[PDB]
Design a protein around this nucleic acid. Structure first.
Ligand SMILES: [Mg+2]
Ligand SMILES: [Mg+2]
Ligand SMILES: [Mg+2]
Ligand SMILES: [Mg+2]
Ligand SMILES: [Mg+2]
Ligand SMILES: [Mg+2]
Ligand SMILES: [Mg+2]
Ligand SMILES: [Mg+2]
Ligand SMILES: [Mg+2]
Ligand SMILES: [Mg+2]
Ligand SMILES: [Mg+2]
Ligand SMILES: [Mg+2]
Ligand SMILES: [Mg+2]
Ligand SMILES: [Mg+2]
Ligand SMILES: [Mg+2]
Ligand SMILES: [Mg+2]
Ligand SMILES: [Mg+2]
Ligand SMILES: [Mg+2]
Ligand SMILES: [Mg+2]
Ligand SMILES: [Mg+2]
Ligand SMILES: [Mg+2]
Ligand SMILES: [Mg+2]
Ligand SMILES: [Mg+2]
Ligand SMILES: [Mg+2]
Ligand SMILES: [Mg+2]
Ligand SMILES: [Mg+2]
Ligand SMILES: [Mg+2]
Ligand SMILES: [Mg+2]
Lengths: 205, 85, 80, 82
RNA sequence: AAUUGAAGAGUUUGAUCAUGGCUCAGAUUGAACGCUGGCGGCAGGCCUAACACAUGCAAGUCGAACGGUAACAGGAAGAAGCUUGCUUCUUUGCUGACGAGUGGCGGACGGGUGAGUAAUGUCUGGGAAACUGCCUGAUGGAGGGGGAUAACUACUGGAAACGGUAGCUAAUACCGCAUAACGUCGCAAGACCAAAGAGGGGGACCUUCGGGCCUCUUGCCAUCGGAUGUGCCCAGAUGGGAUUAGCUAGUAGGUGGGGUAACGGCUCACCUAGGCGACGAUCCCUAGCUGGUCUGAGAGGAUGACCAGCCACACUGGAACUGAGACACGGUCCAGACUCCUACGGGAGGCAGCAGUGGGGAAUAUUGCACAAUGGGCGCAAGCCUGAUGCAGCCAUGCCGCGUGUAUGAAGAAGGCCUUCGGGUUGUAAAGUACUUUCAGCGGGGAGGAAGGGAGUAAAGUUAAUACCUUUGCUCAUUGACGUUACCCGCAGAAGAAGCACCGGCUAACUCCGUGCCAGCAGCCGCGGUAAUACGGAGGGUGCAAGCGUUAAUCGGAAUUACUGGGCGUAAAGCGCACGCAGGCGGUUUGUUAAGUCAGAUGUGAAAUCCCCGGGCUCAACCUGGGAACUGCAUCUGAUACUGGCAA
């Protein structure tokens, strides 16, 4: 299921940082970013249309830590939903429980948040939820379990998450380790580099 | 043959012979009326119809000829007798 | 008022019987052109004196002999 | 002969019956005259655990249909929210 | 809310534009094969031989219908060796029950298969000349008799299967008679047809003291209904072939008789010569049909595996009995092929029911547990039966979910590969360090599917009856195959968990070495004849992931059968020309009809499935509430511009 492999390779191939590390380092020092992976690493700089479409799709997939089958299911759901397909897809990707935990900052990375969720450290609406792909809905309180609280992992993740982007679609107490999903992130609330309208055509090919 | 259905076989056989006897009796009584009509004797035809009528009526009640058939025989023979007379 | 049909006799000599052809204008399922079909049926009628090109009124009734479950009701005009 | 009975239509280990008016000779999930209501043995805390329209049940009962044990128990248990 | 819908590329030429074929990128499956393989949920699992089958099970149930004691669980009497009053042993049906037998109901349901069937079936929409076990409403009866038989005894034939002779006995078995209307036959007067009892309890008056008698429950008979099921008829639709054009004598129609529950050439006697067919008869090949499934923007194309409705069949051919209902899967009889047993005289058999075997095939599972739940058969009930059903076992066959750790980490370690020999890559990757234990494994706790049924009490109901019985409350013990259940808790430990294809273009991803038109690759173009990004190996990279790839099949792309939506001067394609039947189409003015056409209403279009809004399994798959859709068909009521008919 999971990737279970080198992380900087994905960022090097995609040409940008995908936030796969804590943040103290591993952005310029031990990355050799913008150099592509392998022997023919530098000696290459050309790409076709289909290449750029695939690259954007794989960039989104590697950012959110998902596989092709589940991503295709997400695309089908987004297309089914009435509205803008790209916005629906991005909202579906952002609504994942592990992604919401990472946004709240209880985990340094998507992998760490997913590990917490799998190891039963996150509760939703006063209940345990062991599934990482659980879909979070508006007006939902996401918090850490009472028992096993105050762990070194989350303790060392909060201060790092103290100031990276300050998401506006959810509330974070930063006290008792609780938050809230009050609204659904709008496109604006989410980057700008992703050309969702290329994934939409990739899945139309 | 393999389940206790041999009881059903025996019952069917005995009921078959019994019902065959009743059917033969009723058919004899019905056919003598037609013989009378062919002979053209009005009195004989009427007399043969009379004592025959209860036989068919009661065999219908017993569940062997059914009311519609019992009434069909009577209606046809009555029509023929009325035409002959 | 009861359900009935209308058609042309164009029937041959027969004892108290005639065949009628009901004309219907139906649309082709695929190509959409309107074309005419025919459904010949046998009709029972006593005092039968109908002609060839006669228009008759037909009505569904009890099965009267095989291939015969229709009887006439009225005749509108004659052939000649 | 017409009777009112249940029809298991749930999933494995999660039954969900539907009370139907069907001839007795037919199969459990076979043809039925009409569907009256449903029943969920997993009541849970939801606001809908069992529902059936008594109008048609009374119609069929007064027309000559019988009631299974479970259906009769459900009828006399529901009565009217009591 | 339930219409957010349409991509192209390679390949003919020195090059170009067309035309035109082939190939590829997508989706899907009851798949199979190769490599690999941790867990769980839901579903699926002989597509070929309707080939043949060892063994086990899959239809029994009523003593509250009746004779009865073959088992034996009690009791009593009597005879007795006596434990000395307690045991034992032969009778005894009083008894809780009950093998075998008569009788009633059921075996026509459930389950299996797709051989046959091209419309005698199926779908849609209608109809009249019919029946209908069990279940329900109403109105009325339930009187009195008879003759047998099984079982059971005494003999006898038999290897078995299975019998034969002579006697006795009961019934809700059987058969008269009484009774006859709203029922049947008739215009009417008239004639005629039925019945079974059983069980619970107990005052008064009488008993051959075995019960009458009162009451309650249930059961039986006749008619009219209801509902359900089944039978029949009509119209339209439902594959291919014209290198199949004529086919039909009971054939088409009529009168009369017969027959069926019912109409009907359904069947006979006679009379007429009719009937079907180019709008495709007859003949030949193939095929179960539908709701639906796949694909597609749609229209269309393919398809009918699972689920649901209908049809047909049960070793092959045929027939009928019983029954309400069969022309009957685990019934009967006859014939046939095959197999088996035999004491050689004679007999038995039908897995296309659930397991399972042989065989065929690329290919498809356990000779399992339980009637706990639902549903059926019998029964007043308890209860019995149920390979239906609920579960479990095997398979990555499919869809969905999770894991195979996380953070830090430069000496950019070693080794491998390349290297212009400066270095680059593998690569934060590894080692090291700091953390966690989902899922596996070990040990504990513990929902739900369970409603009912039973025993005992209170109230009401019925009645000569505080009885008995029914209904409604209450109290007491309970009823789980799954099941080492789901789920929760505790210990330890990165410990047990990643592979497959591809890298010349289409098409995402490049270098070295070996080989030298050889070995080999290959979906198409095509590579390889000493410097191969195309063969083999290595390093590196891309894609997918408990899966990956190949083969098989359908649709799409294919506007490449073009109705939506194509063409014929030269690319395929105008008959050598003409006349003409059927057929198609048809100038203009008015009236009428209302067929085509259009509008509204009613009925219908099963459920499931698809879609929209919600709810429940820890999310999803999955399950489920409501709606929409179900584009159709029929009837009725209107419109009269156009097409059609009639008239001028
Ligand atoms: Mg048994
Ligand atoms: Mg017995
Ligand atoms: Mg059946
Ligand atoms: Mg009797
Ligand atoms: Mg009498
Ligand atoms: Mg006749
Ligand atoms: Mg007929
Ligand atoms: Mg298309
Ligand atoms: Mg078909
Ligand atoms: Mg019969
Ligand atoms: Mg049978
Ligand atoms: Mg069998
Ligand atoms: Mg089998
Ligand atoms: Mg083989
Ligand atoms: Mg998966
Ligand atoms: Mg329990
Ligand atoms: Mg490329
Ligand atoms: Mg070389
Ligand atoms: Mg096409
Ligand atoms: Mg063309
Ligand atoms: Mg010419
Ligand atoms: Mg001409
Ligand atoms: Mg004109
Ligand atoms: Mg009209
Ligand atoms: Mg939900
Ligand atoms: Mg639904
Ligand atoms: Mg429907
Ligand atoms: Mg006109």
């Amino acid at each position: 299921a999971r990737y279970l492999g080198p992380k900087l390779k994905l960022s090097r191939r995609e040409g940008t940082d995908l936030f796969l590390k804590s943040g103290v380092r591993a952005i310029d020092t031990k990355c050799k970013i913008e150099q592509a992976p392998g022997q023919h690493g530098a000696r290459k700089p050309r790409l076709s249309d289909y290449g750029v479409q695939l690259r954007e799709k794989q960039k989104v997939r590697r950012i959110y830590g998902v596989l092709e089958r589940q991503f295709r299911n997400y695309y089908k759901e987004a297309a089914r939903l009435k509205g803008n397909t790209g916005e629906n897809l991005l909202a579906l990707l952002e609504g994942r429980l592990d992604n919401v935990v990472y946004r709240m900052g209880f985990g340094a990375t998507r992998a760490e948040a997913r590990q917490l969720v799998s190891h039963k450290a996150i509760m939703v609406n006063g209940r345990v939820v062991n599934i990482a792909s659980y879909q979070v809905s508006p007006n939902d309180v996401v918090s850490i379990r009472e028992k096993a609280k105050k762990q070194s992992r989350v303790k060392a993740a909060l201060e790092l998450a103290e100031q990276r982007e300050k998401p506006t679609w959810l509330e974070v107490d930063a006290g008792k380790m609780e938050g809230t999903f009050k609204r659904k992130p709008e496109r604006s609330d989410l980057s700008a580099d992703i050309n969702e309208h290329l994934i939409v055509e990739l899945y139309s090919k | 043959n393999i389940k206790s259905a041999k009881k059903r076989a025996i019952q069917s056989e005995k009921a078959r012979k019994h019902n065959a006897s009743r059917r033969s009796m009723m058919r004899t009584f019905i056919k003598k009326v037609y013989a009378a009509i062919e002979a053209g004797d009005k009195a004989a035809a009427q007399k043969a119809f009379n004592e025959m009528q209860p036989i068919v009526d009661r065999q219908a009640a017993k569940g062997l000829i059914h009311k519609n058939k019992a009434a069909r025989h009577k209606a046809n023979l009555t029509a023929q007798i009325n035409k002959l007379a | 008022k009861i359900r009935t049909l209308q058609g042309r006799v164009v029937s041959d000599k027969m004892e108290k019987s005639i065949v009628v052809a009901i004309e219907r204008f139906v649309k082709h399922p695929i190509y959409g052109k309107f074309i005419k079909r025919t459904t010949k049926l046998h009709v029972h009628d006593e005092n039968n004196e109908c002609g060839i090109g006669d228009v008759v009124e037909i009505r569904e009734c009890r099965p009267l002999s095989k291939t015969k479950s229709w009887t006439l009701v009225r005749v509108v005009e004659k052939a000649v | 002969m017409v009777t009112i009975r249940l029809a298991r239509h749930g999933a494995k280990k999660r039954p969900f019956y539907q009370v139907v008016v069907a001839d007795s000779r037919n199969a459990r999930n076979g043809r039925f005259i009409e569907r009256v209501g449903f029943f969920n043995p997993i009541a849970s805390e939801k606001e809908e655990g069992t529902r059936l329209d008594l109008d048609r049940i009374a119609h069929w009962v007064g027309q000559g249909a019988t009631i299974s044990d479970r259906v009769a128990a459900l009828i006399k248990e529901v009565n009217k929210a009591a």
